[PDB]
Design an enzyme around this catalytic site. Structure first.
Site, PDB file in Angstrom:
ATOM      1  N   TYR A   1      -9.042  70.521 -25.019  1.00 32.86           N
ATOM      2  CA  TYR A   1     -10.306  69.802 -25.157  1.00 32.86           C
ATOM      3  C   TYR A   1     -11.183  70.247 -23.972  1.00 32.86           C
ATOM      4  O   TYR A   1     -10.712  70.922 -23.080  1.00 32.86           O
ATOM      5  CB  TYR A   1     -10.100  68.281 -25.146  1.00 32.86           C
ATOM      6  CG  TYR A   1      -9.325  67.782 -23.934  1.00 32.86           C
ATOM      7  CD1 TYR A   1      -9.940  67.552 -22.721  1.00 32.86           C
ATOM      8  CD2 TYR A   1      -7.953  67.588 -24.002  1.00 32.86           C
ATOM      9  CE1 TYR A   1      -9.229  67.121 -21.611  1.00 32.86           C
ATOM     10  CE2 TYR A   1      -7.225  67.133 -22.892  1.00 32.86           C
ATOM     11  CZ  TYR A   1      -7.876  66.899 -21.703  1.00 32.86           C
ATOM     12  OH  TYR A   1      -7.147  66.463 -20.615  1.00 32.86           O
TER      13      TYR A   1
ATOM     14  N   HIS B   1       0.479  56.290 -20.225  1.00 27.79           N
ATOM     15  CA  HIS B   1       0.063  57.595 -20.704  1.00 27.79           C
ATOM     16  C   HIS B   1       0.941  58.058 -21.885  1.00 27.79           C
ATOM     17  O   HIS B   1       0.417  58.479 -22.918  1.00 27.79           O
ATOM     18  CB  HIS B   1       0.067  58.603 -19.561  1.00 27.79           C
ATOM     19  CG  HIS B   1      -0.536  59.923 -19.926  1.00 27.79           C
ATOM     20  ND1 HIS B   1       0.212  61.077 -20.054  1.00 27.79           N
ATOM     21  CD2 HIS B   1      -1.814  60.277 -20.177  1.00 27.79           C
ATOM     22  CE1 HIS B   1      -0.583  62.081 -20.383  1.00 27.79           C
ATOM     23  NE2 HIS B   1      -1.820  61.621 -20.458  1.00 27.79           N
ATOM     24  N   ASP B   2       2.265  57.953 -21.747  1.00 23.64           N
ATOM     25  CA  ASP B   2       3.167  58.339 -22.823  1.00 23.64           C
ATOM     26  C   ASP B   2       2.835  57.509 -24.074  1.00 23.64           C
ATOM     27  O   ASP B   2       2.848  58.021 -25.201  1.00 23.64           O
ATOM     28  CB  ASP B   2       4.632  58.121 -22.429  1.00 23.64           C
ATOM     29  CG  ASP B   2       5.149  59.144 -21.419  1.00 23.64           C
ATOM     30  OD1 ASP B   2       4.369  59.983 -20.919  1.00 23.64           O
ATOM     31  OD2 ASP B   2       6.346  59.162 -21.053  1.00 23.64           O
TER      32      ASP B   2
ATOM     33  N   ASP C   1      -5.896  61.219 -21.219  1.00 19.57           N
ATOM     34  CA  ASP C   1      -5.704  61.945 -19.976  1.00 19.57           C
ATOM     35  C   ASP C   1      -6.615  61.437 -18.889  1.00 19.57           C
ATOM     36  O   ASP C   1      -6.198  61.296 -17.727  1.00 19.57           O
ATOM     37  CB  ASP C   1      -5.936  63.425 -20.197  1.00 19.57           C
ATOM     38  CG  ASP C   1      -4.759  64.094 -20.872  1.00 19.57           C
ATOM     39  OD1 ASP C   1      -3.730  63.401 -21.112  1.00 19.57           O
ATOM     40  OD2 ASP C   1      -4.784  65.308 -21.161  1.00 19.57           O
TER      41      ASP C   1
ATOM     42  N   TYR D   1      -0.241  58.853 -25.870  1.00 19.15           N
ATOM     43  CA  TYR D   1       0.067  60.019 -26.698  1.00 19.15           C
ATOM     44  C   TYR D   1       0.729  59.498 -27.943  1.00 19.15           C
ATOM     45  O   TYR D   1       0.503  59.984 -29.041  1.00 19.15           O
ATOM     46  CB  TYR D   1       1.025  60.980 -25.971  1.00 19.15           C
ATOM     47  CG  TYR D   1       0.321  61.962 -25.030  1.00 19.15           C
ATOM     48  CD1 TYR D   1      -1.070  61.898 -24.821  1.00 19.15           C
ATOM     49  CD2 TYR D   1       1.033  62.966 -24.374  1.00 19.15           C
ATOM     50  CE1 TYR D   1      -1.713  62.795 -23.978  1.00 19.15           C
ATOM     51  CE2 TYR D   1       0.394  63.864 -23.524  1.00 19.15           C
ATOM     52  CZ  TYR D   1      -0.981  63.764 -23.321  1.00 19.15           C
ATOM     53  OH  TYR D   1      -1.632  64.645 -22.466  1.00 19.15           O
TER      54      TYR D   1
ATOM     55  N   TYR E   1       9.124  57.626 -16.111  1.00 20.36           N
ATOM     56  CA  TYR E   1       8.196  58.026 -17.211  1.00 20.36           C
ATOM     57  C   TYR E   1       7.265  59.221 -16.961  1.00 20.36           C
ATOM     58  O   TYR E   1       6.617  59.739 -17.868  1.00 20.36           O
ATOM     59  CB  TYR E   1       7.416  56.813 -17.624  1.00 20.36           C
ATOM     60  CG  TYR E   1       8.242  55.920 -18.456  1.00 20.36           C
ATOM     61  CD1 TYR E   1       8.957  54.867 -17.878  1.00 20.36           C
ATOM     62  CD2 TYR E   1       8.317  56.125 -19.833  1.00 20.36           C
ATOM     63  CE1 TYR E   1       9.690  54.041 -18.678  1.00 20.36           C
ATOM     64  CE2 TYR E   1       9.066  55.282 -20.609  1.00 20.36           C
ATOM     65  CZ  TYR E   1       9.738  54.261 -20.040  1.00 20.36           C
ATOM     66  OH  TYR E   1      10.476  53.427 -20.841  1.00 20.36           O
TER      67      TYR E   1
ATOM     68  N   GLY F   1       6.831  62.728 -16.884  1.00 15.96           N
ATOM     69  CA  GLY F   1       7.391  64.049 -17.080  1.00 15.96           C
ATOM     70  C   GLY F   1       8.501  64.160 -18.110  1.00 15.96           C
ATOM     71  O   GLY F   1       8.706  65.228 -18.664  1.00 15.96           O
TER      72      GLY F   1
ATOM     73  N   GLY G   1       9.770  60.822 -19.949  1.00 15.80           N
ATOM     74  CA  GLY G   1       9.809  59.455 -20.542  1.00 15.80           C
ATOM     75  C   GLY G   1      10.619  59.214 -21.815  1.00 15.80           C
ATOM     76  O   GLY G   1      10.403  59.868 -22.844  1.00 15.80           O
TER      77      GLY G   1
END
Lengths: 121, 4
Positions: free
Chosen positions: A64, A47-48, A89, A51, A27, A29, A31
């Site tokens: 940001y 994390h994926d 993040d 998003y 996952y 890079g 996923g």
């Protein structure tokens, strides 16, 4: 944006985001599938998924701003997408730091066919 | 500096 996440990674773990986290496990890079192979890989999976809850934002390119009070990550006010991208993040970085002790080189450049099965966010 |  990736610009930020990656400097956030570097500041947090001491490792460079591209080699170290750009192609780890299933996952980190790229996923799409399989069972995460460890802590670090699970961080990427959450994390994926983070998003994922933002279909109308643009994680890789929307920038940001963030600051460090002491060691702490604090997301500065921007657009709603920006604040929420920043929160996803921040999580991943802390997650990467909390599992640095098990980061394994054998999961670098992990081959695609060894990632089998869907896992629900 | 990272991924995807």
């Amino acid at each position: 944006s990736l610009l930020e996440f990656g400097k956030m990674i570097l500041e947090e773990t001491g490792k460079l985001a591209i080699p170290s986290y750009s192609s780890y496990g299933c996952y980190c890079g790229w996923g799409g599938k399989g069972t995460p192979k460890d802590a670090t890989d699970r961080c990427c999976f959450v994390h994926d998924c983070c998003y994922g809850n933002l279909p109308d934002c643009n994680p890789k390119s929307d920038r940001y701003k963030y600051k460090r009070v002491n060691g702490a990550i604090v997301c500065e006010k921007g657009t709603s997408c920006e604040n929420r991208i920043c929160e996803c993040d921040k999580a991943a970085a802390i997650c990467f730091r909390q599992n640095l002790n098990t980061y394994s080189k054998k999961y670098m450049l992990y081959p695609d066919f060894l990632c089998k099965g869907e896992l629900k966010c | 500096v990272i991924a995807k």
